């Protein structure tokens, strides 16, 4: 029961998710809302998806959020 239930998170950090990303992202989101939002959208459907899809790891995240936040 569980663990071996298919489990789909380990196969993203195989591609490009970090236990940091995952964190990062739910610690952000106290942070800018515009991070979130916007990477969600495109973290959302990445995770989720089986294939050859993974959410954005923390170092791309972080770029991300030079991309989402806006300037300052």
Do not use: C, H, W, Y
Not at 20 to 34: I, K
């Amino acid at each position: 029961m569980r663990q071996q239930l298919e489990m789909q998170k380990k196969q993203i950090m195989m591609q490009i998710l970090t236990p940091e990303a995952r964190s990062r992202l739910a610690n952000l989101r106290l942070t800018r809302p515009d991070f979130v939002e916007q990477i969600e959208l495109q973290l959302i459907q990445l995770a989720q998806m089986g294939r050859v899809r993974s959410k954005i790891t923390d170092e791309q995240l972080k770029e991300l959020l030079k991309r989402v936040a806006g300037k300052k």
